[PDB]
From a paper:
Computational designs are seeded by the sequences and structures of defined de novo oligomeric barrel-forming peptides, and adjacent helices are connected by loop building. For targets with antiparallel helices, short loops are sufficient. However, targets with parallel helices require longer connectors; namely, an outer layer of helix–turn–helix–turn–helix motifs that are packed onto the barrels.
Encouraged by the successful design of sc-apCC-6 and sc-CC-7, we extended the seeded design approaches to target α-helical barrel proteins with five, six and eight central helices. By contrast, the six- and eight-helix-based targets bound dye, consistent with accessible cavities, which were confirmed by SEC-SAXS and X-ray crystal structures solved using molecular replacement. The five-helix-based proteins showed no dye binding, although an X-ray crystal structure revealed an open barrel. Thus, the cavities of five-helix-based barrels appear to be too narrow to accommodate dye. However, the symmetry of the central parallel helices is maintained.
Residue numbers in the entry: 0 to 280
Write the structure that this text describes.
């Protein structure tokens, strides 16, 4: 269908997400240098997203356009994970899980830095695409784990908090299986489809966890209540695409449908995050 165009939409939504998350950090800690750095890095990521989108529009349907957009997506997710771990550290400064989130986000950024290095040395290679996609998947797994920790911190007595933790662990297992498949044959579409499937499953967990957080932060907000059904519909859409991707892992149609589900889930996440950003003000 429209692989390259859908990646441009994914990159744009992630840039908006990074900016909103930096606004939340500044709302929680107005005088902190970390929230200042979060805003500066989110702006830098948005600039690289803009540059990649303009480059791809001029080189339609090319491996280079795909690689450059995936690199912007990976860098944007790296700063999201770092800023989110800082937020988790703000809620419970002396908690060991907060220190673990910061360490996990740092390691995800190093993996992202190494994948981009390889991709820049092999811009005409599918191995570069699969490597960058795996860095994206691992960073999303860190985000999902950190977000489930935040959810548990707001209401440790809640069954939904443990459901988010278990869901994040299952998405991590999907990333681990994708990394195994890609390592065995990184120049096949199988590696791309299975890694995209893990990404879609992880974003589905994130969207449902984020909708729970919005509702917990503002039980009387009608916008926050609506995020549950919206995240569930996006999660069902991802589940459909994942089933196609594991049925025909070398299908271009399966790859396209999975990218569409990723883009749609990110739109729900971005909307939900905006509701949270207003709640905290």
């Amino acid at each position: 269908m429209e692989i390259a165009a859908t990646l441009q939409e994914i990159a744009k939504t992630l840039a908006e997400i990074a900016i909103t998350l930096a606004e939340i950090a500044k709302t929680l800690k107005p005088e902190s240098e970390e929230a200042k750095k979060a805003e500066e890095e989110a702006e830098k990521a948005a600039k690289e997203v803009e540059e990649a989108i303009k480059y791809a529009k001029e080189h339609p349907n090319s491996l280079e356009a795909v690689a450059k957009t995936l690199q912007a997506i990976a860098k944007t997710l790296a700063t999201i994970a770092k800023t989110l771990a800082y937020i988790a550290k703000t809620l419970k400064p002396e908690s060991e899980e907060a220190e673990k989130a910061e360490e996990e986000a740092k390691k995800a950024a190093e993996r992202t830095e190494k994948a981009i290095k390889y991709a820049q040395a092999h811009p005409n290679s599918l191995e570069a695409v699969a490597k960058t996609l795996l860095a994206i998947a691992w960073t999303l797994a860190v985000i999902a784990w950190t977000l489930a920790y935040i959810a548990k911190t707001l209401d440790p007595e809640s069954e939904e908090a443990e459901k988010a933790k278990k869901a994040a662990e299952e998405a991590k297992k999907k990333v681990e299986e994708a990394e195994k498949i890609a390592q065995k044959d990184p120049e096949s579409l199988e590696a791309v489809a299975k890694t995209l499937a893990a990404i879609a499953a992880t974003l589905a967990v994130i969207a449902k966890t984020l909708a729970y957080i919005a509702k917990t932060l503002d039980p009387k907000s009608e916008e926050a209540k609506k995020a549950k059904e919206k995240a569930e519909a996006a999660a069902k859409k991802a589940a459909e695409a994942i089933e196609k991707a594991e049925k025909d892992p070398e299908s271009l149609e399966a790859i396209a449908e999975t990218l569409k589900a990723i883009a749609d889930t990110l739109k729900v996440i971005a909307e939900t995050l905006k509701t949270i950003a207003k709640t905290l003000k």
